Amino acid sequence: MAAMEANIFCTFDHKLSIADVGKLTKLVAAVVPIPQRLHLIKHYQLGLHQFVDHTRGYVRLRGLLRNMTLTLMRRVEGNQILLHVPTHGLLYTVLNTGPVTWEKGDALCVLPPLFHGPLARENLLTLGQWELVLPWIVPMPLALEINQRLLIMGLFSLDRSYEEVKAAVQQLQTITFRDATFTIPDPVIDQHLLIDMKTACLSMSMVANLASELTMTYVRKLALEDSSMLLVKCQELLMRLPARPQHVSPDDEIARLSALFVMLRQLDDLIREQVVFTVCDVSPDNKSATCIFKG
Amino acid sequence: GLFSLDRSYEEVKAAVQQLQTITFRDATFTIPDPVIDQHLLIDMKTACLSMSMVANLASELTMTYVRKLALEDSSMLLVKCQELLMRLDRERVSPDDEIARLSALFVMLRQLDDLIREQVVFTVCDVSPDNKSATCIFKG
Amino acid sequence: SLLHTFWRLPVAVFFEPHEENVLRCPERVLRRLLEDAAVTMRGGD
């Protein structure tokens, strides 16, 4: 009976002005999320504003956005917008919503928006206490650093006092990426992040236990007679306190290191987002790019 | 790459030779030794050091955070994790240094992500006795 | 007198008491139990 729609029309019901449809035309080829797929939907379900709540926990918004479906905007006209769902592997054009600069050859991820500078750009169809808050498309290193800093801040919140936590939070709230800088809005610690903390600490202790003698002793052995800036930094990070190896067993060692490999993969997946886009050559004005949709 | 440091002893030479050979369906080729002139190529050094460091950091970092979380887990396996770490202990600071150490752990893990995941490029459809040639479906 | 436990660290209890068995021991209650049992045992050529 049911059919899965691919072309989605969104109809407004607020008596829009000319400036509203003008700003809609500027948004052509952007990406917008939808919670459910139908041929004709109301504007209230479109955009991220429907989910915001007074707690404003960033982890909650990230988790909610992960479940959502992504669509592209095409052929904007009067109070009727056409949204086209992407098909895996096809070649699409997109106009970036946020201010983050792109580069060719890398990957992109979907994240909820960030506090940047004066917070000037919220002109997106503010109408009737509703607004079109779009998600951000950012390159892989910035997204990975954001997830890393949220998780690290959450871990640091434990075993520390209130003011130490405040100082650490105020430091971690900032990020620098490709000559730009951004600030994370409302990174409050919450039970959603506590689940991530529990699974991450379990995986980390597992990688600690699975590590063999040779793997642990490698760094300390290499510090004996090698020297480089990378090595001195790595040694400075670690605590401070030849011989034939105690045990040699390539079969048991390879099994152990394979298990440790799986555990490291599991630990890494905590911060890796879904790789939505792989990019091609970009317009030199940085506004729009050609990309392939994956995942 | 790990055994590169201990190569002088004959045990390591024999183990490296045994690891070097690989066997598969009617295939018995040998892969190249990742060391030259008893030295490591720099990218291999970075990858090996990153793995060994991310192994080393977790051994002395997890205990405090694990023992703090032990009070609350209703899934109750985190307490067994704490006990396992304490058994490992039996087998053998200013907040800024702590935050730097956490950042180092995660950046070192990300450095190893270059080798952790595999691109599943192709899946195969039936092959000719000319087996050099085969058909397959492309996957991202 | 104290018993020897296999696990070095104990664990938190959960679930209602009809799918796994746990004993609970208020010390005052146990003292009353001991006294009552000792008295009633004697109560009951």
CSV table of C-alpha atoms in Angstrom, one decimal:
chain,number,residue,atom,x,y,z
A,1,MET,CA,0.0,0.0,0.0
A,2,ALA,CA,2.5,2.6,1.2
A,3,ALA,CA,5.1,4.2,-1.2
A,4,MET,CA,8.3,5.8,0.0
A,5,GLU,CA,8.2,9.4,-1.4
A,6,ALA,CA,11.4,10.9,-2.9
A,7,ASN,CA,10.1,14.4,-3.9
A,8,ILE,CA,8.9,16.3,-0.9
A,9,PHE,CA,6.8,19.6,-1.0
A,10,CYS,CA,6.7,21.9,1.9
A,11,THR,CA,3.9,24.5,2.1
A,12,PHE,CA,3.9,27.5,4.4
A,13,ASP,CA,0.7,28.8,6.0
A,14,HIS,CA,1.9,32.1,7.5
A,15,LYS,CA,1.1,35.1,5.4
A,16,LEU,CA,4.7,35.7,4.2
A,17,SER,CA,6.1,39.0,3.1
A,18,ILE,CA,8.2,39.6,0.0
A,19,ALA,CA,11.4,39.6,2.1
A,20,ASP,CA,10.6,36.1,3.4
A,21,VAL,CA,10.3,34.6,-0.1
A,22,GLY,CA,13.4,36.6,-1.0
A,23,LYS,CA,15.4,35.0,1.8
A,24,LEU,CA,14.0,31.6,0.8
A,25,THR,CA,15.5,32.1,-2.7
A,26,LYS,CA,18.9,32.7,-1.2
A,27,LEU,CA,18.7,29.3,0.5
A,28,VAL,CA,18.5,27.3,-2.8
A,29,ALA,CA,20.7,24.2,-2.9
A,30,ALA,CA,21.1,24.0,0.9
A,31,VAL,CA,20.5,20.9,3.1
A,32,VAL,CA,17.5,20.7,5.5
A,33,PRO,CA,16.4,17.8,7.8
A,34,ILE,CA,12.9,16.3,8.0
A,35,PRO,CA,11.6,13.9,10.7
A,36,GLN,CA,9.1,12.1,8.4
A,37,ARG,CA,8.6,11.7,4.7
A,38,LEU,CA,5.4,12.6,2.9
A,39,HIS,CA,4.5,14.3,-0.4
A,40,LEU,CA,3.2,17.4,1.3
A,41,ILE,CA,4.2,18.5,4.8
A,42,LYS,CA,3.7,21.6,7.0
A,43,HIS,CA,6.6,24.0,7.7
A,44,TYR,CA,6.4,23.4,11.4
A,45,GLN,CA,8.1,20.0,10.9
A,46,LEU,CA,10.9,21.4,8.8
A,47,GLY,CA,14.1,22.7,10.3
A,48,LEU,CA,15.8,22.1,13.7
A,49,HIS,CA,13.9,24.7,15.7
A,50,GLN,CA,11.1,22.2,16.6
A,51,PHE,CA,13.5,20.2,18.9
A,52,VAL,CA,15.1,23.0,20.9
A,53,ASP,CA,14.1,22.9,24.6
A,54,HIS,CA,15.1,25.1,27.6
A,55,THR,CA,17.8,22.6,28.7
A,56,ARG,CA,19.5,23.2,25.3
A,57,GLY,CA,21.9,20.3,25.9
A,58,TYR,CA,24.2,20.1,22.8
A,59,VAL,CA,24.7,16.3,23.1
A,60,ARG,CA,20.9,15.9,23.0
A,61,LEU,CA,20.7,17.9,19.8
A,62,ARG,CA,23.5,15.9,18.2
A,63,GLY,CA,21.9,12.6,19.1
A,64,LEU,CA,18.5,13.8,17.8
A,65,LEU,CA,20.1,15.0,14.5
A,66,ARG,CA,21.8,11.7,14.0
A,67,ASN,CA,18.4,10.0,13.7
A,68,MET,CA,17.0,12.5,11.2
A,69,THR,CA,16.8,12.3,7.4
A,70,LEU,CA,18.7,14.7,5.2
A,71,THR,CA,17.3,16.4,2.1
A,72,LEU,CA,18.3,19.0,-0.5
A,73,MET,CA,16.4,22.1,-1.5
A,74,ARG,CA,15.4,22.7,-5.2
A,75,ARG,CA,13.2,25.1,-7.2
A,76,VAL,CA,12.1,27.6,-4.6
A,77,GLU,CA,8.9,29.3,-5.5
A,78,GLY,CA,6.0,31.1,-3.8
A,79,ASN,CA,5.2,29.5,-0.4
A,80,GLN,CA,5.9,26.1,-1.9
A,81,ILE,CA,9.3,24.5,-1.6
A,82,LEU,CA,10.5,21.3,-3.2
A,83,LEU,CA,12.9,19.0,-1.2
A,84,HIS,CA,14.7,16.2,-3.0
A,85,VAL,CA,16.0,13.3,-1.0
A,86,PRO,CA,19.5,12.2,-2.1
A,87,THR,CA,20.2,8.8,-3.5
A,88,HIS,CA,23.4,7.1,-2.3
A,89,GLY,CA,26.4,7.6,-4.7
A,90,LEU,CA,25.0,10.2,-7.0
A,91,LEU,CA,26.7,13.6,-7.7
A,92,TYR,CA,25.0,16.6,-6.1
A,93,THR,CA,25.5,20.3,-5.8
A,94,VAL,CA,25.2,22.0,-2.4
A,95,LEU,CA,25.6,25.5,-0.9
A,96,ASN,CA,27.1,25.5,2.6
A,97,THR,CA,25.0,27.1,5.3
A,98,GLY,CA,27.6,27.9,8.0
A,99,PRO,CA,30.7,30.0,7.8
A,100,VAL,CA,33.2,27.1,8.0
A,101,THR,CA,35.6,27.0,5.0
A,102,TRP,CA,35.7,23.9,2.8
A,103,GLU,CA,38.6,22.2,1.0
A,104,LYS,CA,38.6,19.7,-1.8
A,105,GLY,CA,39.4,16.0,-1.3
A,106,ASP,CA,38.1,15.7,2.3
A,107,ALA,CA,34.9,14.5,3.9
A,108,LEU,CA,32.0,16.4,5.6
A,109,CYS,CA,29.7,15.7,8.5
A,110,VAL,CA,26.3,17.0,9.9
A,111,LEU,CA,26.3,18.9,13.2
A,112,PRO,CA,23.9,21.2,15.0
A,113,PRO,CA,24.9,24.9,14.7
A,114,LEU,CA,27.6,26.6,16.8
A,115,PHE,CA,28.1,30.0,18.5
A,116,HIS,CA,30.3,32.0,16.1
A,117,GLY,CA,31.3,35.6,16.7
A,118,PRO,CA,28.6,38.2,17.2
A,119,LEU,CA,25.9,35.6,16.4
A,120,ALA,CA,24.6,37.9,13.6
A,121,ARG,CA,23.1,35.4,11.1
A,122,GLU,CA,19.7,34.3,12.4
A,123,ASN,CA,17.7,36.1,9.6
A,124,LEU,CA,16.5,32.7,8.3
A,125,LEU,CA,12.7,33.1,8.0
A,126,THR,CA,12.0,34.2,11.6
A,127,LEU,CA,8.2,34.2,11.6
A,128,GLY,CA,5.5,33.6,14.3
A,129,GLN,CA,8.0,32.5,17.0
A,130,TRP,CA,9.2,29.9,14.6
A,131,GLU,CA,12.5,30.0,12.6
A,132,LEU,CA,14.4,28.0,10.0
A,133,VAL,CA,17.5,26.9,11.9
A,134,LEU,CA,19.6,24.8,9.5
A,135,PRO,CA,22.3,22.3,10.5
A,136,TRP,CA,26.0,22.8,9.7
A,137,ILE,CA,28.1,21.0,7.2
A,138,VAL,CA,31.7,21.0,8.3
A,139,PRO,CA,34.9,19.2,7.3
A,140,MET,CA,36.0,16.0,9.2
A,141,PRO,CA,38.7,17.5,11.5
A,142,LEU,CA,36.5,20.1,13.0
A,143,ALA,CA,33.7,17.7,13.7
A,144,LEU,CA,36.1,15.2,15.2
A,145,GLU,CA,37.7,17.9,17.4
A,146,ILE,CA,34.2,19.0,18.6
A,147,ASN,CA,33.2,15.4,19.5
A,148,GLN,CA,36.6,14.8,21.1
A,149,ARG,CA,36.4,18.0,23.2
A,150,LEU,CA,32.8,17.3,24.4
A,151,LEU,CA,33.7,13.7,25.4
A,152,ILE,CA,37.0,14.8,27.1
A,153,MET,CA,35.2,17.6,29.0
A,154,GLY,CA,32.6,15.1,30.2
A,155,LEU,CA,35.3,12.7,31.4
A,156,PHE,CA,37.1,15.6,33.2
A,157,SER,CA,33.8,16.7,34.9
A,158,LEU,CA,34.2,13.6,37.1
A,159,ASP,CA,36.8,13.4,39.9
A,160,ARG,CA,37.1,17.3,39.8
A,161,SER,CA,35.6,20.1,41.8
A,162,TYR,CA,33.2,22.7,40.6
A,163,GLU,CA,35.6,25.6,39.9
A,164,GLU,CA,38.2,23.3,38.3
A,165,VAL,CA,35.4,22.0,36.0
A,166,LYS,CA,34.4,25.6,35.2
A,167,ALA,CA,37.9,26.6,34.2
A,168,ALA,CA,38.3,23.4,32.1
A,169,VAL,CA,34.9,23.9,30.4
A,170,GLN,CA,35.6,27.5,29.6
A,171,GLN,CA,38.8,26.4,28.0
A,172,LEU,CA,37.4,23.4,26.0
A,173,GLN,CA,34.4,25.5,24.8
A,174,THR,CA,36.6,27.0,22.1
A,175,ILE,CA,37.9,25.5,18.8
A,176,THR,CA,40.3,26.7,16.0
A,177,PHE,CA,40.1,25.4,12.5
A,178,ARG,CA,41.6,26.6,9.2
A,179,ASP,CA,42.2,30.2,10.3
A,180,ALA,CA,38.7,30.3,11.8
A,181,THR,CA,37.5,30.0,15.4
A,182,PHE,CA,34.1,28.8,16.9
A,183,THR,CA,32.5,28.4,20.2
A,184,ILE,CA,30.3,25.5,21.3
A,185,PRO,CA,26.8,26.5,22.6
A,186,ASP,CA,25.5,25.0,25.9
A,187,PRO,CA,27.9,22.1,26.3
A,188,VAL,CA,26.3,21.1,29.6
A,189,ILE,CA,27.0,17.7,31.0
A,190,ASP,CA,24.0,15.3,30.8
A,191,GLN,CA,23.0,11.7,31.1
A,192,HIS,CA,23.2,11.3,27.3
A,193,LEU,CA,26.9,12.1,27.5
A,194,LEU,CA,27.1,9.8,30.6
A,195,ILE,CA,26.2,6.8,28.3
A,196,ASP,CA,29.1,7.8,26.0
A,197,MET,CA,31.4,8.1,29.0
A,198,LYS,CA,30.5,4.6,30.3
A,199,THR,CA,31.0,2.9,26.9
A,200,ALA,CA,34.2,4.9,26.2
A,201,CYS,CA,35.8,4.1,29.5
A,202,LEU,CA,34.9,0.4,29.2
A,203,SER,CA,36.6,0.4,25.8
A,204,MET,CA,39.6,2.3,27.0
A,205,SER,CA,40.1,-0.1,29.9
A,206,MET,CA,39.7,-3.0,27.5
A,207,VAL,CA,42.5,-1.6,25.2
A,208,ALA,CA,44.6,-1.1,28.3
A,209,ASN,CA,44.2,-4.7,29.4
A,210,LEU,CA,44.6,-6.3,25.9
A,211,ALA,CA,47.9,-4.5,25.2
A,212,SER,CA,50.8,-6.9,25.2
A,213,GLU,CA,54.2,-6.5,26.9
A,214,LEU,CA,56.0,-5.5,23.6
A,215,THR,CA,53.4,-2.9,22.6
A,216,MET,CA,53.6,-1.2,26.0
A,217,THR,CA,57.4,-1.4,26.2
A,218,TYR,CA,57.9,-0.1,22.6
A,219,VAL,CA,57.7,3.6,23.4
A,220,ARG,CA,60.0,3.3,26.5
A,221,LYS,CA,62.6,1.3,24.5
A,222,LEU,CA,62.6,3.7,21.5
A,223,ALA,CA,63.3,6.7,23.8
A,224,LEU,CA,66.6,5.0,24.8
A,225,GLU,CA,68.5,5.9,21.6
A,226,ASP,CA,66.1,7.8,19.3
A,227,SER,CA,65.4,11.6,19.5
A,228,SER,CA,63.0,13.9,17.7
A,229,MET,CA,60.5,16.7,18.6
A,230,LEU,CA,57.6,14.2,18.2
A,231,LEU,CA,59.4,11.8,20.5
A,232,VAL,CA,60.3,14.4,23.1
A,233,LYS,CA,56.7,15.6,23.2
A,234,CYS,CA,55.3,12.1,23.5
A,235,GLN,CA,57.8,11.3,26.3
A,236,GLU,CA,56.9,14.5,28.1
A,237,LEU,CA,53.2,13.5,28.0
A,238,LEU,CA,54.1,10.2,29.6
A,239,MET,CA,55.2,9.4,33.2
A,240,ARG,CA,58.9,8.9,34.0
A,241,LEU,CA,60.3,6.0,36.1
A,242,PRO,CA,69.4,-3.6,26.8
A,243,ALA,CA,67.4,-6.8,27.6
A,244,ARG,CA,66.2,-9.7,25.5
A,245,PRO,CA,62.4,-9.7,25.1
A,246,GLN,CA,60.7,-11.6,27.9
A,247,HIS,CA,58.3,-13.6,25.6
A,248,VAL,CA,58.1,-14.0,21.8
A,249,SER,CA,55.0,-15.6,20.3
A,250,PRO,CA,53.8,-14.2,16.9
A,251,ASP,CA,50.6,-16.3,16.9
A,252,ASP,CA,49.3,-15.2,20.4
A,253,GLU,CA,50.7,-11.7,19.8
A,254,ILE,CA,48.8,-11.4,16.5
A,255,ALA,CA,45.6,-12.6,18.1
A,256,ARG,CA,46.0,-10.1,21.0
A,257,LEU,CA,46.7,-7.2,18.7
A,258,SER,CA,43.7,-8.1,16.5
A,259,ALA,CA,41.5,-8.0,19.6
A,260,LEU,CA,43.1,-4.7,20.6
A,261,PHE,CA,42.5,-3.5,17.0
A,262,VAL,CA,38.7,-4.2,17.3
A,263,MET,CA,38.7,-2.5,20.7
A,264,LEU,CA,40.4,0.6,19.3
A,265,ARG,CA,37.9,0.6,16.4
A,266,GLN,CA,35.1,0.6,19.0
A,267,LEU,CA,36.7,3.4,21.0
A,268,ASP,CA,37.2,5.4,17.8
A,269,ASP,CA,33.5,5.1,16.6
A,270,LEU,CA,32.4,7.2,19.6
A,271,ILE,CA,33.7,10.4,17.9
A,272,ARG,CA,33.4,9.5,14.2
A,273,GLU,CA,30.2,10.9,12.7
A,274,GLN,CA,28.4,9.4,9.8
A,275,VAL,CA,30.4,10.4,6.7
A,276,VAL,CA,27.6,12.1,4.7
A,277,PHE,CA,29.5,13.8,1.9
A,278,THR,CA,32.7,13.3,-0.1
A,279,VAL,CA,33.6,16.6,-1.9
A,280,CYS,CA,34.8,17.6,-5.3
A,281,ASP,CA,36.1,20.9,-6.7
A,282,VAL,CA,34.6,23.9,-5.0
A,283,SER,CA,33.7,27.4,-6.3
A,284,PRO,CA,36.6,29.7,-5.2
A,285,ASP,CA,34.1,31.9,-3.3
A,286,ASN,CA,33.6,28.9,-0.9
A,287,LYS,CA,29.8,29.3,-1.1
A,288,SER,CA,28.9,26.2,-3.1
A,289,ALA,CA,30.5,22.9,-3.9
A,290,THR,CA,29.9,19.6,-5.8
A,291,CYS,CA,29.7,16.6,-3.6
A,292,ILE,CA,28.7,12.9,-3.6
A,293,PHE,CA,26.2,11.7,-1.0
A,294,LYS,CA,27.2,8.7,1.1
A,295,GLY,CA,25.7,6.9,4.0
B,1,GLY,CA,57.1,-2.8,12.6
B,2,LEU,CA,57.0,-3.4,16.3
B,3,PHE,CA,59.8,-6.0,16.3
B,4,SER,CA,62.0,-3.5,14.3
B,5,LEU,CA,63.6,-2.3,17.6
B,6,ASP,CA,64.6,-5.7,18.9
B,7,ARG,CA,66.0,-7.1,15.6
B,8,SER,CA,69.5,-7.9,16.9
B,9,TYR,CA,68.4,-11.0,18.9
B,10,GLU,CA,68.0,-14.2,16.8
B,11,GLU,CA,64.5,-14.9,18.3
B,12,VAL,CA,63.3,-11.7,16.7
B,13,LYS,CA,64.8,-12.6,13.4
B,14,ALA,CA,63.1,-16.0,13.4
B,15,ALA,CA,59.8,-14.5,14.5
B,16,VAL,CA,60.0,-11.8,11.8
B,17,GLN,CA,60.7,-14.5,9.2
B,18,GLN,CA,57.7,-16.5,10.4
B,19,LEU,CA,55.4,-13.4,10.3
B,20,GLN,CA,56.7,-12.4,6.9
B,21,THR,CA,55.3,-15.5,5.1
B,22,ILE,CA,51.6,-15.5,4.4
B,23,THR,CA,49.4,-18.4,3.2
B,24,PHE,CA,46.0,-18.2,1.5
B,25,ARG,CA,44.0,-20.2,-1.0
B,26,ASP,CA,46.7,-21.6,-3.4
B,27,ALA,CA,48.8,-18.5,-2.6
B,28,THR,CA,52.1,-18.5,-0.6
B,29,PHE,CA,53.8,-15.3,-1.4
B,30,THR,CA,56.1,-13.3,0.9
B,31,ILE,CA,55.5,-9.7,1.9
B,32,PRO,CA,58.4,-7.2,2.3
B,33,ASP,CA,60.2,-6.6,5.6
B,34,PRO,CA,59.1,-3.1,6.8
B,35,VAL,CA,62.7,-2.3,8.0
B,36,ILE,CA,65.7,-1.2,5.9
B,37,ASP,CA,69.2,-0.9,7.2
B,38,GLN,CA,67.9,-1.6,10.7
B,39,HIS,CA,65.9,1.6,10.5
B,40,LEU,CA,62.2,2.4,10.3
B,41,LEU,CA,60.5,4.5,7.6
B,42,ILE,CA,59.1,7.6,9.3
B,43,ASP,CA,55.4,6.9,8.7
B,44,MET,CA,55.7,3.4,10.1
B,45,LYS,CA,57.5,4.9,13.1
B,46,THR,CA,54.6,7.4,13.6
B,47,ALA,CA,51.9,4.7,13.3
B,48,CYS,CA,53.7,2.2,15.6
B,49,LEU,CA,54.5,4.9,18.2
B,50,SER,CA,50.9,6.1,18.1
B,51,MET,CA,49.5,2.6,18.7
B,52,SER,CA,52.0,1.9,21.5
B,53,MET,CA,51.3,5.3,23.1
B,54,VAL,CA,47.5,4.9,23.0
B,55,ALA,CA,48.1,1.5,24.6
B,56,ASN,CA,50.4,3.0,27.2
B,57,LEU,CA,48.2,6.0,28.1
B,58,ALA,CA,45.1,3.9,28.8
B,59,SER,CA,46.9,1.8,31.4
B,60,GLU,CA,47.4,4.7,33.8
B,61,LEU,CA,44.5,6.9,32.9
B,62,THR,CA,41.4,4.7,33.1
B,63,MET,CA,41.6,3.7,36.8
B,64,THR,CA,40.5,7.0,38.4
B,65,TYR,CA,37.6,7.6,36.0
B,66,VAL,CA,36.5,3.9,36.2
B,67,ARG,CA,36.5,3.9,40.0
B,68,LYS,CA,34.5,7.1,40.1
B,69,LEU,CA,31.9,5.7,37.7
B,70,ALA,CA,31.7,2.4,39.6
B,71,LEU,CA,29.3,4.0,42.2
B,72,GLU,CA,26.5,4.4,39.7
B,73,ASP,CA,26.4,1.7,37.0
B,74,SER,CA,23.1,-0.1,36.9
B,75,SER,CA,24.4,-2.3,34.1
B,76,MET,CA,27.0,-3.4,36.7
B,77,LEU,CA,29.6,-4.6,34.2
B,78,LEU,CA,31.7,-1.5,34.8
B,79,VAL,CA,32.5,-2.8,38.3
B,80,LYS,CA,33.8,-6.0,36.7
B,81,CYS,CA,35.9,-3.7,34.4
B,82,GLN,CA,37.3,-2.0,37.5
B,83,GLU,CA,38.1,-5.4,39.0
B,84,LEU,CA,39.8,-6.5,35.8
B,85,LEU,CA,42.0,-3.3,35.8
B,86,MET,CA,42.9,-4.0,39.5
B,87,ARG,CA,43.9,-7.5,38.5
B,88,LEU,CA,46.1,-6.1,35.8
B,89,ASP,CA,47.6,-3.8,38.5
B,90,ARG,CA,48.3,-7.0,40.5
B,91,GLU,CA,49.9,-8.5,37.4
B,92,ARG,CA,52.5,-5.8,37.4
B,93,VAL,CA,48.4,16.0,39.2
B,94,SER,CA,47.5,19.5,38.0
B,95,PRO,CA,44.3,19.6,35.9
B,96,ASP,CA,46.1,21.1,32.9
B,97,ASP,CA,48.4,18.1,32.6
B,98,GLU,CA,45.3,15.9,32.9
B,99,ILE,CA,43.4,17.7,30.1
B,100,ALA,CA,46.5,17.7,27.9
B,101,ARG,CA,46.9,13.9,28.5
B,102,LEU,CA,43.3,13.3,27.4
B,103,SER,CA,43.8,15.4,24.3
B,104,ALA,CA,47.0,13.5,23.5
B,105,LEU,CA,45.1,10.2,23.9
B,106,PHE,CA,42.4,11.1,21.5
B,107,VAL,CA,44.7,12.7,18.9
B,108,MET,CA,46.9,9.6,19.0
B,109,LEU,CA,43.9,7.5,18.5
B,110,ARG,CA,42.8,9.6,15.5
B,111,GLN,CA,46.3,9.2,14.0
B,112,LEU,CA,45.8,5.4,14.1
B,113,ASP,CA,42.4,5.8,12.4
B,114,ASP,CA,44.3,5.8,9.1
B,115,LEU,CA,44.7,2.0,9.5
B,116,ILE,CA,41.7,1.0,11.5
B,117,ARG,CA,38.8,1.0,9.0
B,118,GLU,CA,38.6,-0.8,5.6
B,119,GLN,CA,36.9,0.6,2.5
B,120,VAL,CA,34.7,-2.3,1.1
B,121,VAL,CA,35.3,-1.3,-2.5
B,122,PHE,CA,34.1,-4.4,-4.5
B,123,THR,CA,31.9,-7.5,-4.1
B,124,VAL,CA,32.4,-10.2,-6.7
B,125,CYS,CA,30.2,-12.0,-9.3
B,126,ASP,CA,31.3,-15.3,-10.9
B,127,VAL,CA,34.7,-15.5,-12.4
B,128,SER,CA,36.2,-17.0,-15.6
B,129,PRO,CA,38.8,-19.8,-15.8
B,130,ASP,CA,40.8,-16.9,-17.3
B,131,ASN,CA,40.6,-15.9,-13.6
B,132,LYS,CA,42.8,-12.8,-14.1
B,133,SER,CA,39.5,-11.3,-15.3
B,134,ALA,CA,36.4,-11.0,-13.0
B,135,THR,CA,33.2,-9.0,-12.6
B,136,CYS,CA,32.1,-7.1,-9.5
B,137,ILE,CA,29.8,-4.4,-8.2
B,138,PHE,CA,31.3,-1.1,-7.0
B,139,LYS,CA,30.6,0.0,-3.4
B,140,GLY,CA,31.5,3.3,-1.7
C,1,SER,CA,34.7,-15.8,61.1
C,2,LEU,CA,34.3,-13.6,58.0
C,3,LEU,CA,33.8,-15.5,54.8
C,4,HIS,CA,36.1,-15.5,51.7
C,5,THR,CA,34.7,-14.0,48.6
C,6,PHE,CA,35.9,-14.9,45.1
C,7,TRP,CA,35.4,-11.4,43.6
C,8,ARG,CA,37.8,-8.9,45.0
C,9,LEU,CA,35.3,-6.1,44.5
C,10,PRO,CA,31.5,-6.5,45.3
C,11,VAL,CA,28.7,-5.4,43.0
C,12,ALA,CA,25.5,-3.4,43.2
C,13,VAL,CA,22.2,-5.3,43.7
C,14,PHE,CA,19.1,-4.7,41.5
C,15,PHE,CA,15.9,-6.4,40.4
C,16,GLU,CA,13.0,-7.6,42.6
C,17,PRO,CA,13.5,-10.7,44.9
C,18,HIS,CA,11.8,-13.4,42.8
C,19,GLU,CA,14.3,-13.9,39.9
C,20,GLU,CA,17.5,-13.9,42.0
C,21,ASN,CA,18.0,-14.6,45.7
C,22,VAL,CA,19.6,-12.0,48.0
C,23,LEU,CA,19.6,-12.1,51.8
C,24,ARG,CA,19.1,-8.9,53.8
C,25,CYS,CA,20.1,-8.6,57.4
C,26,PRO,CA,19.0,-5.9,59.8
C,27,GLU,CA,21.2,-6.7,62.8
C,28,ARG,CA,18.4,-6.0,65.3
C,29,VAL,CA,16.1,-8.2,63.3
C,30,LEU,CA,18.7,-11.0,63.3
C,31,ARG,CA,19.2,-10.8,67.0
C,32,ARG,CA,15.4,-11.0,67.6
C,33,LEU,CA,15.4,-14.0,65.2
C,34,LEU,CA,18.1,-15.8,67.1
C,35,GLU,CA,16.5,-15.2,70.5
C,36,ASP,CA,13.1,-16.3,69.3
C,37,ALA,CA,14.4,-19.4,67.6
C,38,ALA,CA,16.5,-20.4,70.6
C,39,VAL,CA,13.5,-19.9,73.0
C,40,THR,CA,10.9,-21.6,70.8
C,41,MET,CA,13.2,-24.6,70.1
C,42,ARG,CA,13.2,-25.5,73.8
C,43,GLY,CA,9.5,-24.5,74.0
C,44,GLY,CA,8.7,-27.1,71.4
C,45,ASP,CA,13.7,-43.8,81.3
